[model samples]
Each structure stands twice: as C-alpha cells, then as structure tokens.
Target chain A: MNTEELQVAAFEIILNSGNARSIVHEAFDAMREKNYILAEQKLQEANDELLKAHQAQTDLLQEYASGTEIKIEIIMVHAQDHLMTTMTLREVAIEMLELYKK
Target chain B: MNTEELQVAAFEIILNSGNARSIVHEAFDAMREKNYILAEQKLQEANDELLKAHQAQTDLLQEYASGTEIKIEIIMVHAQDHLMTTMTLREVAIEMLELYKK
Candidate 1:
C-alpha cells in the first residue's frame, strides 16, 4: 500500500496502543491500591484496545505475506513500537497483580 | 525514498534502539544489585545507542519536512516503538537509580 493508506492503519494502531498503555497504567495503579475490581476492569479494557491494534497489525502482516510490499515510514514504525511496549506492560501488570493479589 | 532506502534506515533504528533497551535492562539489574558504577556505565552506553537511533530518526524527519514522503511500513513502525520504549525505560532507570543510590 501507499503512504496514505499505511498512515490510516498506522494511526489506528498508534491510537489503540496508546489507549491500551494508559489503561494498563491505570490498572497498575488500581492494583497498587488493592482495588482488584477496577484493576481487572481496566485490564479488560486494555485488552480490547490491544485487540484493535492487533487487527491493524495483522492486516499489514498478511498483506506483506501476500506479496504486497508495504511502504516503510517512520510513523508506521513508531506505531508498532507503541503496540509492543503496551503489550509488554499488560503482561507485566498481570504478573504484578497476581503477586499483589495474594 | 523507496522501500530499500527506508528499510536500511529503519533497520538501523531498530538495531540501535533494541540495543539501547537491552543496555537499560542491564543498568536496571546492576542498580538492583547496588552496582552503581556498572549501572552508570550501562546507562551511558544506552545513551550512545539511543543517539544513533536519533540520528536516523532525525534524517527521516528532515526528509519528511523537506517534502519527501517516506513510505510507511509495519517494520518501520515497529522500529519506532522499539526506540520509544527504550527511551522511556532509560528515563525510568535514572529515577530508580537516584532512589536506589540513596
């Protein structure tokens, strides 16, 4: 795809990844305060946001697999990083909550 | 620039950024072990790696500013996320170091 098309998808990934990151941050804070209910809810929301990012990411990957050469751009690279870090954060949060809950 | 050119630069960014992240992880581990000297050195190395990423990132931004549209791709977006998380991780390490040092 071209730059414009990639921009739309990249921005979607960025938006959702960023939102997911924030949600996990909130979840971490909630867990710290022993508010498992709120923390659990926020984690769920973060998962939803991450799912949105995954859709975009998966589409791009599948396109590339199908011999569609997606154009490389800085913004698009940033979007992938955004999703990655948030996903890691969520994983860490889960482990943290498991220990904290006990 | 075309796909190959962008790929070269994006790979540079990803390499340096990933290296920086690993350095910061080492720094954090050193700090936890109260190895302040080693921790500080690792942080310095992380900074150097990040500087390399920044150079590539700057070139891309300057290109974009000069009316050259860089192609957007998934790998490029991932490279950015790689840089961003490492940067944030470094910042957090500094703060943690300060606390742990005292």
Candidate 2:
C-alpha cells in the first residue's frame, strides 16, 4: 500500500479508538456516580465504536489475506495506544459497576 | 489466514483482552475498596497487558500491509468482540479512578 493509504487507515483507527475511549469515560462517570443504568448504556456505545474500529482493521486484514499488503507507521502506533487504553477502561468500568451494585 | 492461524490470533486477542479486563477489574477493587495505591498499580498493570495486545494487532497489521492476505473468519469475529468489549471497560476505569480521587 502507498503511504497515503496507510496514513488514512491509521488515522481512521485512531479516530475510532478515541470514540471507544470516550464511551469508556462515559461508562465510568455513570458507574462512579452510582448510575449503573447509564454506565451500561455508555459501555454499549463504546462497544459499538470498538467494533467499528475492528471492522476497519479487519478490512485491511482481508486484503493481506488475499495477498495485498498494508503499510504500518506512527498512526498505527497511535491506534494501538488508543485500543490499549480504551480496553483497560472497559474492564475497570465493569468491575466498578458490580461493586456499586453490591 | 488459515483456520488455525485465525483461531490462534483470535484466541490470543481474547486471552489478552481477558487479561486486560481482569486488570481493569483489579483496578476497580482497589479503587472501590479505597486502596488508591493499589488501584493505580493495577491500572499500570492493565496498561501493560493492553500494550501487549496492541503489539499483536500491530504485527498483524504490518503483515497485511506487507502484502500478505489474511482471511476473515470466526476468529477475526472473536477478536473484534474482544476489542470492543474491552475498549469500553478501559474508558470506564479512568472515570472511576478520577471520581475516587476526587
């Protein structure tokens, strides 16, 4: 793949990751404030974003599976950053929700 | 991507996502129980797992961009599942931490 395509792909991932992260933050707000219902709703939103990001990632993967190649760069790095951070937030949110419920 | 490879990749993502999820859960326990120090530590640990998972994802992306065609299957579906769920959890975790601190 050309550099421009790679950048676009990377940017897309980052943007989606950011969305996922936002949802996670929202979930925490609900949970921390003892709003279990809101927390669950927000988590669902976050999950949607993550799936969108995954879909993009998978599209790229499909290309490679069919013998096409995608490039990697700092944008990819940023996406990774987003995914990791967002993921941690999700798990923590769940645990906190349970605690709040208890 | 062959069935075996996809399965491995999916499994790895799930395993790591689970680890990340667990760490997030731990972070919640620490914070909910008011163990701030432990909560912070657990967050760091969660981040570590996230980074590791990111590494795997990046590797796959790198391969795809390098012109290797990876196939789509249930494994990829599972990876997406892990990514989305975990992403929300991470966001919630941060909010909870902030609330606890306040």
Candidate 3:
C-alpha cells in the first residue's frame, strides 16, 4: 500500500481500538459494582466497538489476501498491541460476569 | 478525570480496536477461502479482543457507578461511533460463518 493508504488504514485501526478500549473500561467498572445490568449494557457497547475493530482488520486482510501488497506499518503494529492487552482485560470482565452468575 | 488520563484512555482504546478489527478481517478471509481452521483461529482472536474492549467499558461504568464524573469527549464519541459500526459488521460475520456451515 502507498504511504497515504497506510496512514488512512492506521488511522481507522487506531480509531476503532480507542472506542473498544473505552467501552471495555466502562463495562469493567460496572462489573466491579456488581451492577450486572449496567455491566451488560456496557458489555454490549464494548462488543459494538470490537465489531468496528473487526471491520478495519478485515479490510486490511482482504487487501493482502487479494494479492494487494499491504505492508505493515508502526501504527498497525501499535494497534495490535492495544488489541491484545485490551482483550486480556476483557477476559477478566467475562470471568467476573461468570462469577456473578454463580 | 484529567486531560492526560483521558488521552491515555483514548489511545489505548484506539489501539485495541484496531487489533481486534485486524483479527476479524483475518477470520473473514479464512472463512471466504473455506479455510475453516484459519477462520476459527481468527474468530478466536476477535473474541479475545472483544474481551479487552469489554474490560475498558467495565472500568468506565464502575467509575460512573461510584459517582465519578467522566466528561465525554469527541474522541470518546468517535470511539462509540466506530464501535456501533463494527458491531453490525460482527453480526454479519457470524451470519457469514453460519451460512458457510450449511
């Protein structure tokens, strides 16, 4: 991909990840208070953010899979870092929910 | 919260969402190619990301539930916007996988 395209893709990845992180934070807070209802709502929002993240990822993958030369940039790498960490935290939240259910 | 804190939060969100999106993209490609194994792997990564996003949302909700003021910012709103769009995409993805099963 050209520099311009990379920048755009990176921007989107960054944007989507940011939303996902924020939503997760909100959900975590709710879970802490044992506010299952609120937690569920926040969880839904977080899920929504993840969906966007997925879309950006899909587009990039499609470009590469379709035999388009799509080079990985720092921004994309940064996005990956964020995604992995946030997911770890989210796992904790899911566990919390399961615990609450028990 | 302070501007710095908000900024940090926003950064993390953007990063996580990007990674999550990338994973989903990979999953979709795998599915398209009828590479069920690869597709499942991608889906697992996506699910992992959804977990991270969930953590962030939970954190925020906890603060709010505890009566902490979280001034909403444009970045946060933008994050939410990305989130909603992405979620619709995920639903579509799930459907895609289901269709493949038949």
Candidate 4:
C-alpha cells in the first residue's frame, strides 16, 4: 500500500494495542479485587484487540519484507512499541492473575 | 557515534531490558510464594537494568532527532519492543505485587 495507507495501518495498530493495554490494566485491577469473572472477561477483550493489532503489523511486515518499502516513520515505530509491550504485558498479567487466584 | 557504536548501544539496551524482564518475572514468582523481600530486591535489580536501557534509548533518540540518522534495522526495532514491553511489565508487576501484599 501507499504511505497514507501504511500510516493508517500503523495508527489502527496503535489504537487497538493501546486499547488492549488499558483493558489488561483493568483486568489486573479486577483480579486485585478478587473479581475473577470480570478479570477473565477483560483479558479476553484485550486479547481480541491485540490480535487485530498483530494482524495489521504482520501484514505490513510481510509486505515490507517482500520489497515494497513503506516510509519508516517514528509513529510506526511507536505503534510497534505499543503492540509488543502490550503483548508481553498480557502474558505476564495472566500469570499474575492465576497466581493471585491460587 | 558510528554505526557499529550505535548497534552496540542498541544491543546493550536489548540485553539489559531483557534482563529486567526476566528479573521482574522472577519477582512475581517470588511474590507468589509470599516472598516479598526477595520480590522487592529483584524489582530493584530490574529497575537498575531498566534505567541503563532507558538511558541508551534516550541517547539514541536525541542523536537521531538531531539529524544523525542511524540506519534503522529490524533488530533495533526488536530491542525497542523489548524495552517498551519490559518497562510496562515492570509497572504492572509492581502493582500486582502490592495488591497481593494487601
């Protein structure tokens, strides 16, 4: 896609990944209160959004590696920062919640 | 500095950030067993390493912003992914441990 298209893709990933981060934060908060059901629900919601963000990133990665390069912008970099960090946070959060429940 | 110097800096940040991630993970594990002292110690160790990594990133960011463009590679991106994610994980983990302590 063009640069504008690429920018949109990056923004979409940023928005969704950011949403995932917020939901996961809430998940931990719920788990803190021993609200296992609400925590689980939030985790699931976070994962759904994370998946969308990952898909967007993967699509661009594949296309970029296949030779057509998108202008590497800092926003794209920042979006990636959000996506990767939130993804790892999700895993760690899940484990923490499990430990708390036990 | 030079490209090689920049690459080394990036690797240093990646290594330290990764170390922080591992330490923080272990901190949570310690917290799971109610080992609050050990958990706190591990968190401190993680923070020291995280500070080093953050400094590295900030240096590069300042240099790059000042017009000395280092060739942005995927590894640099990955290092950032590690750094940002670990930073967030550290915060969440700390909060989780506090909740557990209460």
Candidate 5:
C-alpha cells in the first residue's frame, strides 16, 4: 500500500468509526430515557458501522501480507486511534446498558 | 524520524498503555470486592501510566512536525490502538466508579 492507498483506508476507518461512536452516544441517550428498545437499535447500528471500519482494516492487512508496505502517516494513526476508542467504548457502553436494564 | 525511532516510541506507548490497562482492570477488581479505597489507588496508578503513554505519543508528533515521516507498521498500529483503548476505558471506568460512590 502506498501513502495514498493507506490514507484512503484510514479515511474509511475514521468515517465509519466516527459515526459508530456517535451512535453509541445515541444508544446511551435512549437508555437515559428508559427506552430499552431504542437503545438496542442504536447499539446494532453502531456495531454495523464498526464492522465496516473493521473491513477497511482487514483490507490493509491483506495488502501488507502480500508484500505491500503500508507506510504510516499521522492521519492514519489518528484514524486508528479513533476506531480503537469507539470499539472499546461501545463494549463498555453495552455493559452499562445491561446494568441499566436490570 | 526513521523506522527504528518510531518503533521505539511505539514500544513505549505499548508498554505504558498495557500497564495502564492492567491497572484499570485492577481498579474494577477492587470495586468488585467493595474496596473503594483500593479501587481509587488503582485508578490513580492507571492514570499515571497512561500519562506516560501520552508523553510518548506527543514525542512522535513533535518529530513529525520537524518534517520526519513516521512509517506505518502493524506493531505501531497495535500499540496506538491499545493506548487509545486504555485511555477511553479509564475515563468510562472513572464514571462507573463515581456511580458506585453514589
């Protein structure tokens, strides 16, 4: 993967992960209003978005395995960072939602 | 600047963040045992280690600003991902602790 290719993949990750994070907040918002059904839908939406981001990551990894060097840029790192944060946060938020349900 | 240098900084981030993540779990473990005092101490320890990871990230940004290109490597991405995850997790963990305090 050249620089531009890596950047495109990174952009995909950021766009997907960023939206997922927002939807995660929406899930919590529904929970706050005691709307368990709405919260569950939001969580599902977030998961779907995160899966898109995961696909982008896997694509880059496949390229790397094929002897293509993916050069790192600051933007790519930021994208990865956001993706990581959202994935972790969403998992915790799910646990929080379960507690709220109880 | 070069690959080796970036690798070192990434290693630093991984080490610190890894420890911080462990300490975060320790905080939750203490909470599970109903030892609020010990949980607070563990959280503080996690914060300190995460700060160390943050410093390492900042160091790389400084280098990048000086016109050095940071290359993308799988290991570096993993390290950055872990740091971001721990940082987000710790913040949520603190919020969870506050709820417990109530």
Candidate 6:
C-alpha cells in the first residue's frame, strides 16, 4: 500500500529466499556425502522456505496489480532477485539429486 | 527516465538472465555427458549473458538511487527474480561441474 510496507514485503521475500538458498546448498552438501535421505529433508526445508517467499511475492504482486500504488526501490528489485534465483536453484537441485541417485 | 524505458530495461534484464540460466542448464547437460570442453563453453556463454543482465540491473539501480522516480511493477520484480536466480544457478553449476570432474 505504501513505500514502507512494500519495503517490508520485499525484505520478507529476500530473507526467505536467502534461507531457501542456504538450505538448498546444504542439500547439495548432503548429497555429496551420499546421504540421500538427509539431502531430501534439506530439499524439503528449502522448499518450505521458497513457498513462504513465493507467497509474499504473490501478495505483493496482487496488491500492486489491484491498482494499489507501490513505490519501487532498488532493495525491492534485489529482493526479487533473491526470490527468483532460489526458485530456479531448487528445481535444478532436484534434478541433480535424481541424477546422483542413478 | 520513463515507464516504458524502465520496462524495456526490466525486460532486458529478464531476457539475458533467462539466457544465462538456459546456458547453465546446457552446461550441466554437457557435464553429465562428460563433455568438459563443451560444458566449459556453455558456462562461458552463460557468463557473458549474466554480465549483460548485471549491467542492465546496475544501470537501473543507479537511475533509481539518484532520486529518479521509478514506477513499481510486478514485471520488474519478476525480471529481478530471473536475474538473481540465474546468478546463483551459475555458481552452483560450477561447483557441480568441479565435483563431476573429480
């Protein structure tokens, strides 16, 4: 609705996305150690984090699209960057995990 | 300095970032096939695309930080998402390639 509110949303997206990324990396580490179960758990944790960030992003988008004026800031863009990157990483990690299973 | 210009910039960021992600994926494919040279070439192509996206993002940030008003839009945020995610994907791909090399 306002600049500050938008900024908070952006930060939420960044924080959760960052968490997702960390967990995904941990999953990769587990996979490296050949702990497939633990790796899957980490991947699940990362997925949960991603879902939260995705929800926040969706809410922000809905608010903006509903004719609500939102102020754009670099941090907001940075937050988007964090969210998008983690999402993609999650997908690739899943694929890689399957490959390692073979 | 206007909405359309900003939108174009955002699209550029998204396009190049998407390209980088694709190349990174291809690199992974090559790595899976044990084609190290081709994999490295794919990574190089991704790096170039990432550079272009990063520059576009930098310019957008500079413009915004200098007191120029930018309209907040979901597409812009999505673009940022594409850019940030590709960057992280690139790093992970490199690490995975190294592991495969071992």
Error of 3 at B11 (Å): 30
CAPRI quality of model 5: acceptable
DockQ each candidate and list the results. Answer: 0.26, 0.13, 0.03, 0.33, 0.42, 0.41
Off by over 4 Å in 5: A29-38, A58-85, B37-45, B61-67, B72-78, B95-102
lDDT of 4 by residue, B1-102 (tens): 776986898799899999999999999999999899999899999999999999988888777667675677777888887889789978886877777686
Best-to-worst ranking by lDDT:
4, 6, 5, 1, 2, 3
Tens digit of per-residue lDDT, candidate 3, span B1-101 = 47557656655665676677667667666766667778777777776776576566667668779987877543553354345334444555666666655
TM-score of predicted model 5? Answer: 0.69
> How do these models rank on DockQ, best leading?
5, 6, 4, 1, 2, 3
Q: In every candidate, what fraction of the native interface contacts is reproduced?
A: 0.54, 0.21, 0.00, 0.43, 0.68, 0.64
- Give per-residue CA lDDT, model 5, range B75-95, as digits (tens): 877888888888888877675
Error of 4 at A69 (Å): 3.1
lDDT of 4: 0.86
Residues A2-100, candidate 3: write the lDDT tens digits: 779777866776777778788878877777787888887777777777767667666766675466765565676666545544554454455346445
Colliding pairs, model 1 = A71-B72, A72-B71, A76-B77, A77-B76, A77-B77, A77-B78, A78-B77, A81-B81
The most accurate candidate by DockQ is 5
lDDT of 3 at A46: 75
Superposition error at B65 for model 3 (Å): 50
Candidate 4: how large is its RMSD? 3.8
Whole-model alpha-carbon lDDT for candidate 2 = 0.72
TM-score of 1: 0.65
For residues B1-102, write the lDDT of model 1, one tens digit per residue.
487898888899989998998888788678767788999999999999998998998888899998988876666766776777778778867776776677
